[PDB]
Amino acid sequence: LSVDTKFKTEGLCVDIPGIPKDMTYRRLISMMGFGYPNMFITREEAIRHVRAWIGFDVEGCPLQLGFSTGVNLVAVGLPWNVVRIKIVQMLSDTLKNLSDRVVFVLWAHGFELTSMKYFVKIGPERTCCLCDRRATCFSTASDTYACWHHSIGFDYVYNPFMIDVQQWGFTGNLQSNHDLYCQVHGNAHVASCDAIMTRCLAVHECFVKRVDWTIEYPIIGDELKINAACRKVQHMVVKAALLADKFPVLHDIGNPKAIKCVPQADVEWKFYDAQPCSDKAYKIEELFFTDGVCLFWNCNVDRYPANSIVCRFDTRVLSNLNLPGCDGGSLYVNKHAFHTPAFDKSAFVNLKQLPFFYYSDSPCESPLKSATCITRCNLGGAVCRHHANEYRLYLDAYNMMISAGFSLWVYKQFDTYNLWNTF
Ligand SMILES: O=C(NCc1nc(C2CC2)cs1)c1cc(CNCC2CC2)[nH]n1
Ligand SMILES: [Zn+2]
Numbered sequence: 001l002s003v004d005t006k007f008k009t010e011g012l013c014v015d016i017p018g019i020p021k022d023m024t025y026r027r028l029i030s031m032m033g034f035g036y037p038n039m040f041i042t043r044e045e046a047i048r049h050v051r052a053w054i055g056f057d058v059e060g061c062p063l064q065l066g067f068s069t070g071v072n073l074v075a076v077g078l079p080w081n082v083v084r085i086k087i088v089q090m091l092s093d094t095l096k097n098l099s100d101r102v103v104f105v106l107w108a109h110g111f112e113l114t115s116m117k118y119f120v121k122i123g124p125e126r127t128c129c130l131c132d133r134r135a136t137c138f139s140t141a142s143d144t145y146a147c148w149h150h151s152i153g154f155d156y157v158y159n160p161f162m163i164d165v166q167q168w169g170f171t172g173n174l175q176s177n178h179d180l181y182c183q184v185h186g187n188a189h190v191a192s193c194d195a196i197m198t199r200c201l202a203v204h205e206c207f208v209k210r211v212d213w214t215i216e217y218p219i220i221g222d223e224l225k226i227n228a229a230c231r232k233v234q235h236m237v238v239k240a241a242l243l244a245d246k247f248p249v250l251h252d253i254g255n256p257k258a259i260k261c262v263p264q265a266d267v268e269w270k271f272y273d274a275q276p277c278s279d280k281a282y283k284i285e286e287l288f289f290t291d292g293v294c295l296f297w298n299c300n301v302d303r304y305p306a307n308s309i310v311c312r313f314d315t316r317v318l319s320n321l322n323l324p325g326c327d328g329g330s331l332y333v334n335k336h337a338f339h340t341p342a343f344d345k346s347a348f349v350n351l352k353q354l355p356f357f358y359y360s361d362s363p364c365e366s367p368l369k370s371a372t373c374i375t376r377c378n379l380g381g382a383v384c385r386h387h388a389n390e391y392r393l394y395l396d397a398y399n400m401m402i403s404a405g406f407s408l409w410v411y412k413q414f415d416t417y418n419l420w421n422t423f
């Protein structure tokens with residue numbers, strides 16, 4: 001983002017009367033008092049760094065500093081020299097396991113930008129004094145720099161980034177634009193409410209209305225183990241449903257790039273294309289199947305049919321992979337960014353929770369007691385060691401997937417008792 005790019009200033013002219021209409025980022029940054037070519041960034045760079053987004057609003061009358069973490073600080077009610085210490089602590093704790101930077105998302109009216117100099121220092125890109133991550137904070141006590149992990153006691157935010165949502169060409173104020181898409185965040189006339197709304201609207205614009213599944217996001221947690229667990233569980237559960245109930249046809253509704261998850265199964269496999277719905281859940285009436293079984297693997301519909309196998313992401317889950325989203329939805333970032341419509345328990349009324357089970361027909365070849373280890377093994381009274389090992393690996397994956405937020409549902413007649421006679 002060129003510092004010579006033009007910045008529209010109408011939003012700022014109520015806090016800053018007489019501000020020039022003709023303004024560049026270069027001159028704004030100067031007016032604000034200030035590897036790092038611009039404090040501001042493009043919508044594209046911002047999207048690549050969605051994990052760093054912290055909505056931010058400042059409201060005057062002595063100022064109130066609201067952030068999308070729900071926090072409201074008053075700077076005078078306490079002086080700035082303590083308020084900046086709290087800001088560093090809050091952002092470091094919020095972001096250390098998410099991103100290597102902060103990106104302040106704004107609906108800029110002026111106070112938020114003029115307040116920055118009181119808690120931000122800028123300069124050349126640097127590295128942490130105690131590790132190799134880029135520096136995000138600075139301390140004036142020790143003249144040293146630190147990342148989010150090592151910033152305890154540090155008092156200034158260092159080389160923050162920011163983006164003003166009002167530059168994207170909106171009509172009317174923040175609430176009137178946010179409420180067009182979202183009924184979950186209110187307008188309680190505290191600064192944090194605006195900050196939360198600002199981020200929500202930004203997420204809606206970049207991930208609900210606009211979608212880019214080509215953007216990749218760095219590994220920050222159990223991504224790989226989780227995705228592997230999901231493939232393992234998917235194969236297990238679908239294979240067992242075909243054996244227990246012997247459906248003649250399976251209707252695989254969802255990703256157009258889907259491959260048969262149980263390739264050796266007898267059934268007639270029919271695919272139906274539906275991209276991840278990022279806004280509202282698909283209506284099963286538009287999508288549509290009563291023959292056999294329907295596989296909705298992360299295909300969010302509003303009411304699943306009774307003859308389904310379903311894996312559905314639970315947006316309420318607290319994890320580093322799952323960011324708060326728009327209108328109760330969540331932004332699940334695991335390699336790619338998937339805004340997900342809000343979890344709705346009623347979608348599953350025709351189904352039941354799927355119980356844990358492990359099923360294997362593999363030879364017993366290389367002490368576990370479990371009623372859910374479904375193997376010739378246990379049928380004959382004593383689980384062999386190989387199936388004990390596999391059982392404990394599968395449980396681990398299964399638990400990994402559930403705790404990552406996924407939930408599993410199945411048709412009501414599913415009964416693992418029917419699998420024992422496949423031995
Ligand atoms: O009164 C708001 N904060 C509370 C505040 N305490 C202070 C003093 C330090 C104690 C200053 S301000 C507030 C007002 C809004 C309005 N946002 C939407 C605009 C109206 C279209 N947001 N927060
Ligand atoms: Zn560090």
Ligand SMILES: [Zn+2]
Nearest residue numbers: 182185200327
């Ligand atoms: Zn919202």
Ligand SMILES: [Zn+2]
Nearest residue numbers: 364377384387
């Ligand atoms: Zn065995």
